[PDB]
Amino acid sequence: VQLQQSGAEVKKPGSSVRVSCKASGGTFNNNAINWVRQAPGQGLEWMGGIIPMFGTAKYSQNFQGRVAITADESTGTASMELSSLRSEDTAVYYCARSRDLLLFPHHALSPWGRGTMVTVSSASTKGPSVFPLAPGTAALGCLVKDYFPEPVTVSWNSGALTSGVHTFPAVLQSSGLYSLSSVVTVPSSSLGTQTYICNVNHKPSNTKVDKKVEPK
Amino acid sequence: ELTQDPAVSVALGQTVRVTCQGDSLRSYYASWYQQKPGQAPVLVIYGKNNRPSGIPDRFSGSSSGNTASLTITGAQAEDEADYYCSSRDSSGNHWVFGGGTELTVLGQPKAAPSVTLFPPSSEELQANKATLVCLISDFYPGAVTVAWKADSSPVKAGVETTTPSKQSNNKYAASSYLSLTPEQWKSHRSYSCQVTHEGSTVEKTVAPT
């Protein structure tokens, strides 16, 4: 039983966002789906939950009036809509399963989805520029420059290459835009012969770009 | 409301205890979540000392009055994380979380930063921009500063530098970016990124040559 969540979003203050949580097995059965958020660098806060089998939901009073959770038991999908958005709603939003109350009185929240980053900002969206960082071992990388908002993801060779990869936390520039880099450490003997490609994804700008990184 | 100590330390291989307190714990059992940087929380203990599948038996829980405790024996570097307690509220309607406890596992070796400095790419120069990229990783403890030089002269303008962030191996990462015109980049003999860590300096240089 795994939970899959919709992708990162950006919304302007005053608007609304809908975030999805999908059950891998196609069904929620008996269970509740809970929504828990985490503002950057802060703790966890429960927002509400639903039992899709009956559609019954309860909400944190911190949000009552601008949160609504619904579900489609037929597609095993649950959605949380947060409206009248404010900057302080910028957070990663998780879904997490709880089991039936009376049958599992002492159980908790598990499993958790991977989280959905939602940024609430009136600043303009900006897709990144991607540049190759050309190379015992050698380091090579990709520069992901001047974008907004978070997040960006980087994979290497379409995810085939994971060992030796380090994707750094973004810098928030004084300009208000972000930049990050991803580097992989590889055997220098491989530089002539092995193709290395970074795959950069920035959902808010609908950016999906590959860059081959060659020796100069 | 649930309260926890903001932080607790433990020596490598030893036993650490994280406490949780609140009136709702009179009604329900606390549950405990482990969260590492950039990751979703993971349930480790619930109910009367129950462990979910795949959680090692080094983790255990107990409860008493309006308190609960998470105990980790034989602490490993890998146990370093934030630990949250949670429970149903006294009403039994909603969920409440404690503020989290930052667990530090001590005894980690001093480690110098690995520094990698990249010059501007051909592609970026062609687009009439120039960014030097200084990438700093695997240092401990997590305190560095970064500075730049043109030839042997300090350069403070056009610099954007992160504060250190904890890596998954409990060492730290940081980065710095220096923006130049192509003309500036071409003008000097070299540029340097200089990283200061624990009274030591790591300087890497690049040259348009």
Numbering used by the authors:
A (entry chain H): 2 to 136, 144 to 224
B (entry chain L): 3 to 211
Tell me, in the authors' exact words, what the paper reports.
B-cell activating factor (BAFF; also known as BLyS, zTNF4, TNFSF13B, THANK, and TALL-1) is a member of TNFSF and a crucial factor for survival and maturation of B cells. BAFF is expressed as a homotrimeric transmembrane protein that can be released as a soluble homotrimeric cytokine after cleavage at a furin protease site. In 2011, the FDA approved belimumab (Benlysta), a fully human monoclonal IgG1λ antibody neutralizing soluble BAFF, as the first targeted therapy for SLE in the past 50 years since the introduction of corticosteroids and immunosuppressive therapy. Here we report the 2.05 Å resolution structure of the BAFF–belimumab Fab complex and 1.90 Å resolution structure of belimumab Fab alone for elucidating the molecular mechanism of this antibody drug against BAFF.
The crystal structure of the belimumab Fab fragment alone was also determined and refined to 1.90 Å resolution with R/Rfree = 0.167/0.206. Despite the absence of the binding partner (BAFF), the electron density of belimumab was clear throughout the entire structure of the Fab fragment, including all six CDRs. The elbow angle of the belimumab Fab, defined as the angle subtended by the two pseudo-dyad axes relating the variable and constant domains of a Fab fragment, differed by about 5° between the BAFF-bound and free belimumab structure due to intrinsic elbow flexibility. Structural comparison of the belimumab CDR loops before and after binding to BAFF showed little conformational deviation and minor adjustments in the side chains involved in the interaction with BAFF, implying that belimumab maintains the CDR loops in productive conformations prior to binding to BAFF, thereby contributing to the high-affinity binding.
